[PDB]
Amino acid sequence: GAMAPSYRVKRMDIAKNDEECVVNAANPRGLPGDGVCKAVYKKWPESFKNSATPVGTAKTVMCGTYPVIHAVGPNFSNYTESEGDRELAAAYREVAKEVTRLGVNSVAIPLLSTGVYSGGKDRLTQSLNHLFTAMDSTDADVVIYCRDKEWEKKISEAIQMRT
Ligand SMILES: [Cl-]
Ligand SMILES: [Cl-]
Ligand SMILES: [Cl-]
């Protein structure tokens, strides 16, 4: 584990992360997809061998010795708010189990279901709070990746408020 486990946020492509493993915002079919998923496919294509997994779950595939944890958040265009909220919380709980099993000291993670699976809604607080609920009991250093400048400021504020 990290000596003083922390949360940090960076505004840049998660495919350039400086952590021991990455979480992909995957689709259930293991397809290249769009957004974070497509960047992950371009950087670690070998990790998409048998990466298909249901909504609300995470499945890790190695690219060399580097773990890619494919976490499938719900698409809020298809799910109700209640069911989607439950599956989004579940995907993050599965990421925490995988990070613990892998024994890594750090993990790069995107906010699941905030892009094309958001159903056109701002889900920063919803998704980030489910990330904290799952990851708080782990001792890995967590680095959250985002692309929007206003989202970077809001995620940073939420991290600092709890310290
Ligand atoms: Cl970048
Ligand atoms: Cl998304
Ligand atoms: Cl973003």
From Swiss-Prot:
It is found in: Host cytoplasmic vesicle membrane. It is a peripheral membrane protein. It comes from the Viruses. ADP-D-ribose binds at residues 13, 27, 35, 115-117. Phosphorylated by host on serines and threonines. Residues 4-163 form the Macro domain. Changing residue 27 to A: Partial loss of mono-ADP-ribosylhydrolase activity; complete loss of ADP-ribose 1'' phosphate phosphatase activity. Changing residue 117 to V/W: Almost complete loss of mono-ADP-ribosylhydrolase activity. Seems to be essential for minus-strand RNAs and subgenomic 26S mRNAs synthesis. Displays mono-ADP-ribosylhydrolase activity. ADP-ribosylation is a post-translational modification that controls various processes of the host cell and the virus probably needs to revert it for optimal viral replication. Binds proteins of G3BP family and sequesters them into the viral RNA replication complexes thereby inhibiting the formation of host stress granules on viral mRNAs. Interacts with mRNA-capping enzyme nsP1. Interacts (via C-terminus) with host G3BP1; this interaction inhibits the formation of host stress granules on viral mRNAs and the nsp3-G3BP1 complexes bind viral RNAs and probably orchestrate the assembly of viral replication complexes. Interacts (via C-terminus) with host G3BP2; this interaction inhibits the formation of host stress granules on viral mRNAs and the nsp3-G3BP2 complexes bind viral RNAs and probably orchestrate the assembly of viral replication complexes. Interacts (via C-terminus) with host NAP1L1. In the N-terminus, the macro domain displays a mono-ADP-ribosylhydrolase activity. The central part called, the alphavirus unique domain (AUD) has a zinc-binding function. The C-terminus region, also called hypervariable domain (HVD), is mainly disordered and binds several host proteins. This intrinsically disordered domain contains 2 SH3 domain-binding sites and 2 FGDF motifs necessary and sufficient for the formation of nsP3/G3BP complexes. This is Non-structural protein 3. It comes from Chikungunya virus (strain S27-African prototype) (CHIKV).
